[PDB]
Tab-separated table of C-alpha atoms in Angstrom:
chain	number	residue	atom	x	y	z
A	28	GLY	CA	5.442	27.232	8.600
A	29	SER	CA	5.730	24.329	11.307
A	30	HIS	CA	5.360	26.662	14.021
A	31	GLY	CA	1.710	27.391	15.805
A	32	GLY	CA	-0.629	24.462	17.143
A	33	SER	CA	-0.456	25.297	20.494
A	34	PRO	CA	-3.438	24.792	22.749
A	35	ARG	CA	-5.404	27.367	24.269
A	36	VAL	CA	-8.765	27.483	26.301
A	37	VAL	CA	-11.949	29.909	25.049
A	38	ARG	CA	-15.159	30.221	26.793
A	39	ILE	CA	-17.906	32.032	24.742
A	40	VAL	CA	-21.714	32.214	26.037
A	41	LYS	CA	-24.225	32.261	23.380
A	42	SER	CA	-26.079	35.201	22.316
A	43	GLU	CA	-29.895	34.560	20.942
A	44	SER	CA	-27.733	34.751	17.939
A	45	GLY	CA	-25.482	31.579	18.504
A	46	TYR	CA	-21.972	31.367	19.307
A	47	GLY	CA	-20.893	33.821	16.421
A	48	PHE	CA	-18.351	31.379	14.353
A	49	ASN	CA	-18.754	28.788	12.009
A	50	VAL	CA	-17.238	25.279	12.300
A	51	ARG	CA	-15.781	23.558	8.909
A	52	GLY	CA	-14.073	20.127	8.589
A	53	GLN	CA	-14.594	16.162	7.623
A	54	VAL	CA	-18.384	14.586	7.041
A	55	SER	CA	-16.464	11.028	7.947
A	56	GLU	CA	-15.044	9.879	11.075
A	57	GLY	CA	-12.094	8.765	11.837
A	58	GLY	CA	-8.526	9.396	10.043
A	59	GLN	CA	-4.944	9.208	10.709
A	60	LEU	CA	-3.099	10.806	13.659
A	61	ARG	CA	-0.640	13.422	12.269
A	62	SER	CA	1.551	15.499	13.946
A	63	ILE	CA	0.670	19.473	14.934
A	64	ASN	CA	3.670	20.598	17.324
A	65	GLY	CA	4.985	17.451	18.486
A	66	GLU	CA	2.120	15.368	19.372
A	67	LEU	CA	-0.239	12.898	17.049
A	68	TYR	CA	-4.147	14.171	16.852
A	69	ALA	CA	-6.587	12.270	14.692
A	70	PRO	CA	-8.814	14.922	12.345
A	71	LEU	CA	-9.702	17.962	13.868
A	72	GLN	CA	-13.210	20.466	12.659
A	73	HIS	CA	-11.946	23.779	12.418
A	74	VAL	CA	-12.955	27.540	12.753
A	75	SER	CA	-14.011	28.790	8.905
A	76	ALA	CA	-15.020	31.984	9.918
A	77	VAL	CA	-15.968	34.301	13.006
A	78	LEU	CA	-19.066	36.836	12.928
A	79	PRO	CA	-17.182	39.982	13.594
A	80	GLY	CA	-18.560	41.626	17.018
A	81	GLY	CA	-20.104	38.380	18.002
A	82	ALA	CA	-19.538	36.434	20.784
A	83	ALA	CA	-16.889	34.175	19.513
A	84	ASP	CA	-15.044	37.033	18.301
A	85	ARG	CA	-15.044	38.697	21.692
A	86	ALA	CA	-14.311	35.766	23.639
A	87	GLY	CA	-10.914	35.357	21.549
A	88	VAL	CA	-11.515	32.493	19.101
A	89	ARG	CA	-9.422	32.907	15.175
A	90	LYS	CA	-9.949	31.902	12.206
A	91	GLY	CA	-8.367	28.645	11.600
A	92	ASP	CA	-8.300	27.464	15.408
A	93	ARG	CA	-8.798	23.876	15.227
A	94	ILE	CA	-11.390	22.142	17.441
A	95	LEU	CA	-9.617	19.594	20.057
A	96	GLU	CA	-11.890	19.464	22.985
A	97	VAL	CA	-15.734	20.711	23.232
A	98	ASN	CA	-17.541	20.660	26.674
A	99	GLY	CA	-14.942	18.192	28.063
A	100	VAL	CA	-14.745	16.165	25.120
A	101	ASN	CA	-12.058	14.932	22.982
A	102	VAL	CA	-13.332	15.108	19.114
A	103	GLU	CA	-10.118	13.953	17.072
A	104	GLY	CA	-11.374	11.906	14.464
A	105	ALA	CA	-15.108	13.305	15.077
A	106	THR	CA	-17.553	14.162	12.189
A	107	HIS	CA	-18.535	17.667	11.389
A	108	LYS	CA	-22.292	16.473	12.621
A	109	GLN	CA	-21.069	14.815	16.093
A	110	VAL	CA	-18.895	18.252	16.517
A	111	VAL	CA	-21.696	20.842	15.793
A	112	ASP	CA	-24.041	18.580	17.781
A	113	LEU	CA	-22.160	18.694	21.275
A	114	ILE	CA	-21.711	22.445	20.231
A	115	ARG	CA	-25.719	22.731	19.722
A	116	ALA	CA	-26.553	20.319	22.513
A	117	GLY	CA	-28.569	23.217	24.492
A	118	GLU	CA	-26.360	24.627	27.218
A	119	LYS	CA	-25.330	28.125	27.158
A	120	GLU	CA	-21.711	28.352	27.808
A	121	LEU	CA	-19.273	26.344	25.393
A	122	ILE	CA	-15.805	25.485	26.539
A	123	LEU	CA	-13.248	24.866	24.077
A	124	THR	CA	-10.070	23.816	23.495
A	125	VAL	CA	-8.267	24.732	20.247
A	126	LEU	CA	-5.036	24.302	18.523
A	127	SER	CA	-3.893	27.984	17.300
A	128	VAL	CA	-3.199	27.865	13.513
A	129	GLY	CA	-0.003	25.847	12.587
A	130	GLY	CA	2.090	23.255	10.453
A	131	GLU	CA	0.761	24.604	6.993
A	132	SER	CA	3.010	27.144	4.700
A	133	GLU	CA	1.722	29.168	1.464
A	134	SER	CA	3.643	30.287	-1.337
A	135	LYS	CA	2.493	32.743	-4.112
A	136	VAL	CA	3.093	31.023	-7.803
B	26	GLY	CA	-20.874	17.928	2.181
B	27	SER	CA	-19.504	14.331	1.221
B	28	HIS	CA	-20.043	15.179	-2.777
B	29	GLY	CA	-16.863	16.944	-4.993
B	30	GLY	CA	-13.510	16.002	-5.336
B	31	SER	CA	-13.874	14.982	-8.698
B	32	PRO	CA	-10.470	15.299	-11.025
B	33	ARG	CA	-9.822	17.826	-13.647
B	34	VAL	CA	-7.201	19.020	-15.758
B	35	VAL	CA	-5.858	22.919	-15.798
B	36	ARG	CA	-3.482	23.980	-17.899
B	37	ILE	CA	-1.865	27.717	-17.309
B	38	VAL	CA	0.818	29.819	-19.119
B	39	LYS	CA	2.607	32.059	-16.780
B	40	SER	CA	3.044	35.654	-17.293
B	41	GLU	CA	6.052	37.870	-16.050
B	42	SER	CA	3.796	37.966	-12.995
B	43	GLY	CA	3.591	34.137	-12.527
B	44	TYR	CA	0.412	31.757	-12.556
B	45	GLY	CA	-1.267	34.082	-10.425
B	46	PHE	CA	-2.998	31.847	-7.684
B	47	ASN	CA	-1.243	30.673	-3.890
B	48	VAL	CA	-0.596	27.179	-2.832
B	49	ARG	CA	-1.128	26.009	0.953
B	50	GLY	CA	-0.507	23.125	2.467
B	51	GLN	CA	1.498	20.812	5.005
B	52	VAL	CA	5.134	21.601	5.782
B	53	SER	CA	6.370	18.147	6.114
B	54	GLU	CA	5.794	14.883	4.146
B	55	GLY	CA	4.073	11.603	4.001
B	56	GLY	CA	0.406	11.425	6.359
B	57	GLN	CA	-2.057	8.643	5.786
B	58	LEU	CA	-4.364	7.927	2.491
B	59	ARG	CA	-7.822	9.242	2.964
B	60	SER	CA	-10.647	8.763	1.080
B	61	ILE	CA	-11.947	11.826	-1.504
B	62	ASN	CA	-15.078	10.734	-3.674
B	63	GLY	CA	-14.105	6.951	-3.157
B	64	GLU	CA	-10.084	6.852	-3.425
B	65	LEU	CA	-7.564	6.601	-1.096
B	66	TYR	CA	-5.124	9.588	-1.751
B	67	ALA	CA	-2.227	10.824	1.028
B	68	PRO	CA	-2.148	14.468	1.825
B	69	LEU	CA	-2.968	17.090	-0.871
B	70	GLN	CA	-1.792	20.842	-0.903
B	71	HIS	CA	-4.513	22.760	-2.195
B	72	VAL	CA	-5.232	26.338	-3.739
B	73	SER	CA	-5.854	28.984	-1.476
B	74	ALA	CA	-6.228	31.976	-3.145
B	75	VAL	CA	-6.631	33.205	-7.165
B	76	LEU	CA	-5.141	36.595	-8.271
B	77	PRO	CA	-8.576	37.925	-9.886
B	78	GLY	CA	-7.712	38.437	-13.700
B	79	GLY	CA	-4.468	36.147	-13.889
B	80	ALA	CA	-3.699	33.476	-15.926
B	81	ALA	CA	-4.933	30.957	-13.241
B	82	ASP	CA	-8.170	32.791	-12.538
B	83	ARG	CA	-8.599	32.634	-16.470
B	84	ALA	CA	-7.462	29.249	-17.472
B	85	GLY	CA	-10.201	27.982	-14.875
B	86	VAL	CA	-8.438	27.305	-11.318
B	87	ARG	CA	-10.823	27.576	-8.349
B	88	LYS	CA	-10.227	28.385	-4.649
B	89	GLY	CA	-9.809	25.368	-2.759
B	90	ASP	CA	-8.947	22.913	-5.832
B	91	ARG	CA	-6.433	20.435	-4.071
B	92	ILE	CA	-3.350	19.515	-6.251
B	93	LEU	CA	-3.044	15.901	-7.531
B	94	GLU	CA	-0.614	15.972	-10.351
B	95	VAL	CA	2.010	18.698	-11.483
B	96	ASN	CA	3.575	18.569	-15.054
B	97	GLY	CA	3.301	14.408	-14.650
B	98	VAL	CA	4.283	13.841	-11.215
B	99	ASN	CA	2.232	12.683	-8.632
B	100	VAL	CA	2.215	15.284	-5.201
B	101	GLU	CA	0.418	13.170	-2.749
B	102	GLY	CA	1.900	13.296	0.735
B	103	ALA	CA	4.425	16.130	-0.948
B	104	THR	CA	5.517	18.964	1.307
B	105	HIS	CA	4.986	22.130	0.464
B	106	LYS	CA	8.420	23.128	-0.344
B	107	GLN	CA	8.179	20.277	-3.278
B	108	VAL	CA	5.047	20.924	-4.923
B	109	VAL	CA	6.000	24.791	-5.013
B	110	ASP	CA	9.370	23.862	-6.679
B	111	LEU	CA	7.456	21.438	-9.240
B	112	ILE	CA	5.508	24.587	-10.181
B	113	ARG	CA	8.537	26.809	-10.123
B	114	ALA	CA	11.050	24.390	-12.248
B	115	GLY	CA	11.127	26.940	-14.794
B	116	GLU	CA	8.883	25.727	-17.768
B	117	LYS	CA	6.098	28.560	-18.838
B	118	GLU	CA	3.361	25.874	-18.970
B	119	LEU	CA	2.036	24.170	-16.050
B	120	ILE	CA	-0.396	21.170	-16.296
B	121	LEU	CA	-2.159	19.768	-13.352
B	122	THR	CA	-4.455	17.523	-12.358
B	123	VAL	CA	-6.736	19.132	-9.409
B	124	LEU	CA	-9.983	17.433	-7.253
B	125	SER	CA	-12.469	20.087	-6.770
B	126	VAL	CA	-13.427	20.788	-3.211
B	127	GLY	CA	-15.571	18.358	-1.549
B	128	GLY	CA	-15.883	16.102	1.580
B	129	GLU	CA	-16.036	18.767	4.140
B	130	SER	CA	-19.420	20.567	5.589
B	131	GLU	CA	-19.547	24.034	7.311
B	132	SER	CA	-22.185	24.865	10.143
B	133	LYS	CA	-23.086	27.933	12.014
B	134	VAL	CA	-23.036	27.841	15.380
């Protein structure tokens, strides 16, 4: 429904096996400012899957989390490759601000 | 990646158990025109799951299909309740134009 979308910080230290999640979203840059929970954001990449037992799972990353800030950089409207490149920059700890899922409904037909 | 998003028609006749899929998308109306495969569309609801063996599965509806036209009505920018209400209007056959998945990439981090 219309609820959700609230910000929270997650910090994850990578294992030799990475941060233990997949990021999914737009290939191209830009897009229009849509309301998530009262404020306009340009398009966000999101967490499409979390490796069970992996570092992100243990740190509290959830399926669907929308990625707002990565390591101190706002990524609204970023391309998929830009966001992935920030995560993979080379430092061991990743500090995210994420928006929890929200603003969508689902119905059986 | 950037490919996909191509239109196709799917027709589904409901069983006493419905059309056998779930639709997911924005609760609110409107939104900006983004490029899918060369043309601007306002936001589309999508197929979030398909009941295995159900009518939609057998008719060729796929996970992720974005719903462009329902029974002769364009649903770009529609609310979730509006789209669901068109599908559930009461007629037995549903005639969709869908856009196949496309325009997103996914990476393991």
